[PDB]
Amino acid sequence: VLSLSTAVKELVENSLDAGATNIDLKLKDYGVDLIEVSDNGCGVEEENFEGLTEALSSLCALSDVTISTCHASAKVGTRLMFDHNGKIIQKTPYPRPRGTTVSVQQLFSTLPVRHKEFQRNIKKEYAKMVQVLHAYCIISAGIRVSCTNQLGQGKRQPVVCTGGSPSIKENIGSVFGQKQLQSLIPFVQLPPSDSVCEEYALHNLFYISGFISQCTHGVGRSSTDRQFFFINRRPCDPAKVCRLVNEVYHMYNRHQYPFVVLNISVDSQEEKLLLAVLKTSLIGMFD
Amino acid sequence: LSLSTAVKELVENSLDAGATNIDLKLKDYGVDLIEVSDNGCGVEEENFEGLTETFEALSSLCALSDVTISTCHASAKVGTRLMFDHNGKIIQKTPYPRPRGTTVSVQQLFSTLPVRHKEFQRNIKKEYAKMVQVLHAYCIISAGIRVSCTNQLGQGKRQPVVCTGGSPSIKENIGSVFGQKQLQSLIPFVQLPPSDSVCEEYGLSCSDALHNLFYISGFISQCTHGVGRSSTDRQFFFINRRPCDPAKVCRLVNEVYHMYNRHQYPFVVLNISVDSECVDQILLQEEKLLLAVLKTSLIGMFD
Ligand SMILES: Nc1ncnc2c1ncn2[C@@H]1O[C@H](COP(=O)(O)OP(=O)(O)OP(=O)(O)O)[C@@H](O)[C@H]1O
Numbered sequence: 217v218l219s220l221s222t223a224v225k226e227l228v229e230n231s232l233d234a235g236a237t238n239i240d241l242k243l244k245d246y247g248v249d250l251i252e253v254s255d256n257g258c259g260v261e262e263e264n265f266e267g268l269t270e271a272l273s274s275l276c277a278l279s280d281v282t283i284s285t286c287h288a289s290a291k292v293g294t295r296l297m298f299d300h301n302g303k304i305i306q307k308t309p310y311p312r313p314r315g316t317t318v319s320v321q322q323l324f325s326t327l328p329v330r331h332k333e334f335q336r337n338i339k340k341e342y343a344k345m346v347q348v349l350h351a352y353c354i355i356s357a358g359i360r361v362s363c364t365n366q367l368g369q370g371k372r373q374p375v376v377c378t379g380g381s382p383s384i385k386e387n388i389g390s391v392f393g394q395k396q397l398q399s400l401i402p403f404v405q406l407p408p409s410d411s412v413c414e415e416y417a418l419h420n421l422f423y424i425s426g427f428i429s430q431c432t433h434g435v436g437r438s439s440t441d442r443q444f445f446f447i448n449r450r451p452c453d454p455a456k457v458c459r460l461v462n463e464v465y466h467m468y469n470r471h472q473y474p475f476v477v478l479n480i481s482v483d484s485q486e487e488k489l490l491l492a493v494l495k496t497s498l499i500g501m502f503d
Numbered sequence: 504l505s506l507s508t509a510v511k512e513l514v515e516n517s518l519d520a521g522a523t524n525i526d527l528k529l530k531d532y533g534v535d536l537i538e539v540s541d542n543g544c545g546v547e548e549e550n551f552e553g554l555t556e557t558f559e560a561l562s563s564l565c566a567l568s569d570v571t572i573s574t575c576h577a578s579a580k581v582g583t584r585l586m587f588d589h590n591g592k593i594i595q596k597t598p599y600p601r602p603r604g605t606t607v608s609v610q611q612l613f614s615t616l617p618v619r620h621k622e623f624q625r626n627i628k629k630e631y632a633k634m635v636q637v638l639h640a641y642c643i644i645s646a647g648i649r650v651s652c653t654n655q656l657g658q659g660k661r662q663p664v665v666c667t668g669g670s671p672s673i674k675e676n677i678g679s680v681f682g683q684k685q686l687q688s689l690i691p692f693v694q695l696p697p698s699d700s701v702c703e704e705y706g707l708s709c710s711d712a713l714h715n716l717f718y719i720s721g722f723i724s725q726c727t728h729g730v731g732r733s734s735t736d737r738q739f740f741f742i743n744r745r746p747c748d749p750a751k752v753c754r755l756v757n758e759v760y761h762m763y764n765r766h767q768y769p770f771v772v773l774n775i776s777v778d779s780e781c782v783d784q785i786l787l788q789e790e791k792l793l794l795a796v797l798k799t800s801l802i803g804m805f806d
């Protein structure tokens with residue numbers, strides 16, 4: 217849509233919305249040539265093919281979109297080709313398992329300026345997409361998320377793959393290795409302290425979970441390269457929450473920055489209460 | 504009992520389960536961990552105890568390693584995680600929320616046989632190379648299935664080994680495994696009826712060649728000088744999509760290629776399709792007819 221990372225985000229969310237347990241992201245030239253997301257979700261029924269094309273409509277205007285899909289109620293799958301207006305160029309029977317594969321080829325080709333900027337800044341744009349990819353890998357418990365990349369004429373190479381584990385801890389281990397888990401402690405939520413409450417509580421509905429680096433000297437990280445925040449399992453960047461987490465960690469380890477995976481679960485406001493719970497909990501953890 | 508046959512047994516089990524994704528995770532070339540994850544049919548609860556070159560496979564792996572299995576059948580509401588002792592007995596079974604499929608973890612293969620374990624470690628480079636060859640064969644022939652493999656040495660980062668893109672063609676799987684540059688020097692196999700000259704060389708009559716039921720397909724290097732390979736490091740033969748080593752067929756392919764490029768050896772991916780009743784060392788009935796078809800076809804291709 218706007219970038220490589222947001223295009224991947226939209227396609228992954230669509231696979232998640234379809235109830236997929238396998239989500240495979242296939243890239244060619246870091247996504248400059250091909251962005252392809254394949255899932256084993258519910259698929260699309262024939263009567264809704266034209267209704268596919270909004271994320272998918274915007275992708276059609278900015279790239280060449282091919283979609284293959286097979287609904288559980290269908291006897292055979294279907295392969296669809298779209299023009300830049302979202303109109304179906306052709307639809308043919310296509311033998312494939314249940315699910316949907318969305319192919320985004322030559323993203324931004326219809327906008328030459330954006331296409332050229334995409335290529336020039338591919339290292340930064342790919343790093344943003346990896347961050348989004350890692351966030352979904354960590355939080356999507358029970359879902360096997362994978363990514364592969366193929367550069368030029370070279371062989372296809374695996375980038376990451378999760379094992380469909382029910383715990384965030386194992387998903388973290390799948391993404392970064394077991395060595396990353398050895399320097400982490402689980403988040404332990406505490407009621408806000410009288411002192412911290414004064415610095416800023418009976419109707420507390422915030423539930424915090426996750427992992428953070430130990431405050432022990434040397435155990436931290438050189439930068440904020442691995443900090444993942446979630447509100448109701450949705451990846452996001454809460455500025456005030458992120459600053460508070462790094463501030464409390466620096467109270468005990470000013471030389472380093474922590475690894476962070478924090479999910480904020482709350483009913484469908486009162487952010488000062490959330491910060492008071494976060495600060496009190498982090499102080500009790502690092503003490 | 505080797506690293507390659509252990510991986511082969513697990514990959515075949517995932518293929519038998521109807522998997523479309525097969526993920527192989529290795530640690531220390533498989534000395535520390537061999538883990539195969541698939542999205543196949545899984546195992547039903549009533550068959551958990553029944554779970555425990557041929558390496559059965561799972562019972563033999565339990566005797567030689569620590570086997571952990573998580574699985575979820577479509578008929579189950581929640582998956583199950585299983586731990587096995589070296590006699591194949593279930594140490595513990597716990598509910599385990601996971602998607603449909605099976606994950607088999609083989610950690611410290613051959614640990615219970617210290618002599619074999621040291622031979623495994625000492626010859627790990629040769630055993631790992633043999634396993635990669637077997638894995639490449641399944642990657643090439645398993646069209647429509649995403650097979651991936653990584654290897655991790657100690658505490659280092661995961662290293663890519665191979666991965667296919669779930670493509671419907673053997674040609675695309677070759678490109679995924681070896682790169683598009685490998686495809687540029689290949690030509691497709693074109694089957695021809697055996698020629699009178701080649702039929703005479705094998706002592707075949709017109710009636711012997713009338714019941715031809717061999718169907719050969721695949722890819723081979725061009726005979727153009729220099730385009731070949733330094734050795735037979737990339738020659739993959741299949742009978743009814745099954746990886747195998749037909750000695751006479753393999754020698755014939757290299758012999759005809761040497762008729763046009765004696766200095767080099769070709770890249771070979773060749774599947775031989777034939778009725779199951781004619782396969783019995785690979786013993787193919789009417790093998791002289793198959794060799795005559797192969798030689799005649801290869802000569803027409805390289806001419
Ligand atoms: N991988 C998919 N699997 C099954 N159905 C899909 C998939 N992707 C898209 N669809 C269907 O096509 C519809 C339009 O997709 P689109 O992403 O453009 O908008 P949306 O999903 O409805 O809302 P949002 O803007 O939040 O993504 C979707 O609502 C969905 O029904």
Ligand SMILES: Nc1ncnc2c1ncn2[C@@H]1O[C@H](COP(=O)(O)OP(=O)(O)OP(=O)(O)O)[C@@H](O)[C@H]1O
Nearest residue numbers: 516517520541543544545546554559560561562605
């Ligand atoms: N990845 C798997 N997915 C689903 N079921 C499996 C899987 N692996 C093993 N099983 C089940 O456990 C049984 C025993 O496995 P094992 O490989 O040891 O023997 P086998 O497959 O029955 O015969 P063989 O391996 O000699 O062809 C299998 O028959 C199968 O039902």
Ligand SMILES: [Mg+2]
Nearest residue numbers: 226229230271
């Ligand atoms: Mg959407």
Ligand SMILES: [Mg+2]
Nearest residue numbers: 512515516560
């Ligand atoms: Mg088996």
